[PDB]
Each structure stands twice: as structure tokens, then as C-alpha cells.
Amino acid sequence: KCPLMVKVLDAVRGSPAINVAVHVFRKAADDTWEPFASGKTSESGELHGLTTEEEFVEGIYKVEIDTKSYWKALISPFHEHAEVVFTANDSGPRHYTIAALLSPYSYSTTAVVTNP
Amino acid sequence: PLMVKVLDAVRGSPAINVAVHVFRKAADDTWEPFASGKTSESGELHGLTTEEEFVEGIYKVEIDTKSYWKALGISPFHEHAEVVFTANPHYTIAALLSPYSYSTTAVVT
Amino acid sequence: PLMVKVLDAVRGSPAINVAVHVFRKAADDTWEPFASGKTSESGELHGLTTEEEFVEGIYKVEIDTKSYWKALGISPFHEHAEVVFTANPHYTIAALLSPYSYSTTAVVT
Amino acid sequence: KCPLMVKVLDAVRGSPAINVAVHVFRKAADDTWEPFASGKTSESGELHGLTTEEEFVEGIYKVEIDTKSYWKALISPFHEHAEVVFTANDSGPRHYTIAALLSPYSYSTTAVVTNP
């Protein structure tokens, strides 16, 4: 394998952040954000199967994590969502895990990049 | 009412000369330029806007983290960091930068 | 030369009235009390020490995060947060608190 | 299963933090920190097998992550180590993952607590 994975934790509960919606976009030649993939985290706070090594070509990707819907569905948080934007696969294929740690007024995000 | 502070977690210092662009979501759902600056020597950016123009609405603060790391000779992961929020308490948007990670917090007083 | 700032990531605010204890590692490898205070209304603690007494050495800053969350009616994970470092650039120790997580950064200028 | 696990990431490299030494202590009846377990992270940045459900009784535990040796063994970091101190198993047995994200002048740590 899965070349793009998202893992989300809840810093308030000390648990996986479950049922967090995630939308992925890819910059198109026109320079606009085209829908690329979407899904939601599981009970372990992970999201797999967004894409395939074949479809995940080079490009600029935006991973939007819908944190406000997450918190509301539980609390009124600060951010609308957490947006992770990066160039991918520009030195050849890699695997990416986008990790995010969520608090109502704060989040962090880290990328773990490996080369299968 | 809107302040940006950026810290470098690799050097344990303010992140200086970082470009910051603020946008407001237009009725057409597009992002209109609203304000921009470079962080100061203390990693701070002030006077982006006034209480008058900073009306309720959704805002985006884009921090050009990539140019920052490149200036320092370091290869970073993100294109930029983006903070998106509804203005509806002075807002401080703080960001802590590492090459492959960043954290952002809102201090609303 | 030593400042502590504490933020609450749940409320997006300064963490007020948080007890902070600083210790210095003695030659006997024990931790000697060195300084302590409560964060202010701005989540800040200053005047812990002077340039004179803040000599090189290893220091520990203990932040009583547990009492903080309990005062707010919230069940937290950590007993406290601990920042341990060698003083050898003004040191700002900043901490960002959540019930089950905290981050700490050093800003050395 | 393993009731106490540690996971460490490097925020500079975007990778697991490998060969990070970790020492665990438990507060004794005397109120001093007794050695409880130690180990080092693997190539995936994880450390398993510190202890067993049977030995991991209630108590106050300190997980010390030796971040300075880690960075030096690569850079001169700020902290001596990252120290995670918590009461465990006071409402019955739980499983704990202590996650830490490391930068030379900053770290974060999060607990994920589950009830098998």
C-alpha cells in the first residue's frame, strides 16, 4: 504493498482516532486540485487502500484530514481540517505514511517515507 | 487580532524570514489573498490585519516551510504548512517545524 | 535566562496556574531543588533564576500536568512532564499539553 | 499480548528512530525508581517484549528514552532524554504504547491505552 497510508491518533482520549474522513487530491496540469482518493480511518485509526503503486504517480498531493467533522461528531475544535501537502515519487516510487495527532486546538503531522 | 509565530525544532530557534500568506474564503468558495509577510527575527509576524477587516469567515494561513528548509540546505517533506480555521476570543497561530513533521496550535485569548 | 511557557491544546489557551519545579543535578547525581513557580495568566513563568546562579550543569524542569488536568475535571495520562537538559545561546522551555500527549521544545537564543 | 510498547519516529529524516535505548523504571514502596526493564528500538522504531502482563503490575512507571545518545550517535541535541511518567494498571490491566516523535530541540510523546 500500500503506497499511501494515514494513521490518526486522538491526544485527548489516548486512543486511535476512528472514523476520521480523509480526502486526497493531486495537483493537475492545470494547477488545480483534482480528487484522487478518499476514505475513513478504521477502529485502529488507520486508513489503507487509498491507492495503488500503479496509480500513485509522481505529483503534488494534498491529504486533507477532516478533523472538525471528527471533533464535532464527538466538541467544537479550532481547525476546519488538517491539510498535508507534499511532492511524492519524484525520486522514484516510495511508500508514505501520513501520521497525525489531534487535539481540539492543535494537531501535528509527520511523514514516514520508505523505499520498498 | 492575528499573529503568527514559527519555531524551528531542528535548531531550537525562531524560524526567521519564513513567508506567510493568509487567504480568506470568498463566497465563490475560492481563496482570496488577504495578508502576507515574512517572519521576523523572533519568528514572529504581526500586523497582518486589523480588527476591522478581520471579520468572521474561514481563513487559511499558508507557511512556506519548503523554502525555509531549502535555504538552510535541508530537504523537507511538505510543500508548505496550511492552517485553516473559522474566525468567529486575539488569535495566535503557532507552528513548530521539522523537515518531515510540523505541529500547529491555536492560542485564542 | 530561563523561561517556561505552557499551552493547553484542548482549550487553545495558556495553561494557567500550572506548578513548575526546576532541579539541578548535584554531584551526588541527585536532584537538588533549584527554583519553582506557578505559570501566570499568560501560561508563563519567569524570574526562576538569575544569570549568576544558572551555571552550566544538568537541569530538570518538572511541570505538574496531572494537577492541571484534574483541576479541570479531566483524567490525564502523565504524572507530570519532565524536561531534562544541559545548560552550557536565554532558554525558553515550552510545553504543549493534551490529556494523553505533550510536546516540549527548547528555544535557545 | 505485549502490555508495554514504545514506538519512536525521527522528524528530521521522516523515518523510524532505530537503536534508541529505552530504560523503564517503577516507583518502589520506598518511593525510589527501581529498574524495571530496558531495551532498544528496532529498524521499525519499535520496542516490544519489555515486560509481561504478569510482571507489569499496578504502579508508577517511568519510560526514559535516551534521545541524546540517539542524536549524538548520528548531532548535538537539547535534551538529555525524554522521560514519560505515568500510573499504570490502576483500573485493571491495560496495554500501553508510548509513542515519541523526536527532533534535536523538541520532542512529543503520546500514550495509546487499550483494554485487551
Side-chain angles (χ1 to χ4, degrees), chain A residues 2-4 6 8-17 19-26 28-29 32-33 35-39 41-42 44-54 56-61 63-71 73-74 76-82 84-116, chain B residues 1-2 4 6-10 12-15 17-24 26-27 30-37 39-40 42-43 45 47-50 54-61 63-69 71 73-81 83-87 89-109, chain C residues 1-2 4 6-10 12-15 17-24 26-27 30-37 39-40 42-43 45 47-50 54-61 63-69 71 73-81 83-87 89-109, chain D residues 2-4 6 8-17 19-26 28-29 32-33 35-39 41-42 44-54 56-61 63-71 73-74 76-82 84-116:
Chain A
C2 183
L4 174 64
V6 178
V8 187
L9 298 178
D10 177 326
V12 169
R13 293 152 163 254
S15 68
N19 304 140
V20 179
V22 173
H23 296 253
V24 187
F25 309 84
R26 183 185 176 270
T32 62
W33 290 114
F36 179 81
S38 65
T41 58
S42 63
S44 71
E46 294 177 353
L47 171 52
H48 318 261
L50 284 161
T51 190
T52 63
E53 291 175 338
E54 239 186 51
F56 191 41
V57 295
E58 193 279 341
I60 301 171
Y61 289 82
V63 174
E64 157 204 298
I65 307 167
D66 293 335
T67 55
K68 187 192 210 174
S69 296
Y70 167 84
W71 286 118
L74 293 150
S76 311
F78 186 71
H79 305 94
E80 293 293 305
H81 46 238
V84 184
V85 179
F86 59 103
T87 300
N89 304 310
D90 205 21
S91 316
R94 296 298 191 272
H95 282 201
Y96 297 84
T97 296
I98 305 306
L101 174 71
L102 305 188
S103 302
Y105 280 68
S106 179
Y107 62 86
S108 86
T109 181
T110 312
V112 173
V113 183
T114 54
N115 179 186
Chain B
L2 172 68
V4 177
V6 190
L7 289 187
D8 174 334
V10 164
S13 74
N17 220 19
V18 173
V20 181
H21 300 252
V22 192
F23 313 87
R24 186 184 219 274
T30 69
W31 292 110
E32 306 184 2
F34 177 87
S36 61
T39 57
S40 86
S42 83
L45 182 49
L48 276 163
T49 182
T50 59
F54 199 48
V55 307
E56 300 187 290
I58 301 158
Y59 293 84
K60 171 190 268 165
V61 171
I63 303 170
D64 173 14
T65 58
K66 182 173 177 190
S67 308
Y68 174 75
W69 291 120
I74 291 166
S75 187
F77 173 80
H78 301 94
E79 288 295 298
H80 50 242
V83 174
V84 183
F85 64 99
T86 292
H90 177 84
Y91 294 81
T92 294
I93 305 302
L96 177 65
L97 307 187
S98 298
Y100 279 73
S101 195
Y102 63 87
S103 63
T104 186
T105 312
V107 184
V108 187
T109 50
Chain C
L2 172 68
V4 177
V6 190
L7 289 187
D8 174 334
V10 164
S13 74
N17 220 19
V18 173
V20 181
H21 300 252
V22 192
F23 313 87
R24 186 184 219 274
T30 69
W31 292 110
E32 306 184 2
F34 177 87
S36 61
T39 57
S40 86
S42 83
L45 182 49
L48 276 163
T49 182
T50 59
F54 199 48
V55 307
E56 300 187 290
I58 301 158
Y59 293 84
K60 171 190 268 165
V61 171
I63 303 170
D64 173 14
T65 58
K66 182 173 177 190
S67 308
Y68 174 75
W69 291 120
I74 291 166
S75 187
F77 173 80
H78 301 94
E79 288 295 298
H80 50 242
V83 174
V84 183
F85 64 99
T86 292
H90 177 84
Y91 294 81
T92 294
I93 305 302
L96 177 65
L97 307 187
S98 298
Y100 279 73
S101 195
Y102 63 87
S103 63
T104 186
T105 312
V107 184
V108 187
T109 50
Chain D
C2 183
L4 174 64
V6 178
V8 187
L9 298 178
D10 177 326
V12 169
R13 293 152 163 254
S15 68
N19 304 140
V20 179
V22 173
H23 296 253
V24 187
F25 309 84
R26 183 185 176 270
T32 62
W33 290 114
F36 179 81
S38 65
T41 58
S42 63
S44 71
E46 294 177 353
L47 171 52
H48 318 261
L50 284 161
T51 190
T52 63
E53 291 175 338
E54 239 186 51
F56 191 41
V57 295
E58 193 279 341
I60 301 171
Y61 289 82
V63 174
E64 157 204 298
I65 307 167
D66 293 335
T67 55
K68 187 192 210 174
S69 296
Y70 167 84
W71 286 118
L74 293 150
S76 311
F78 186 71
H79 305 94
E80 293 293 305
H81 46 238
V84 184
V85 179
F86 59 103
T87 300
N89 304 310
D90 205 21
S91 316
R94 296 298 191 272
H95 282 201
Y96 297 84
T97 296
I98 305 306
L101 174 71
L102 305 188
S103 302
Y105 280 68
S106 179
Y107 62 86
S108 86
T109 181
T110 312
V112 173
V113 183
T114 54
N115 179 186

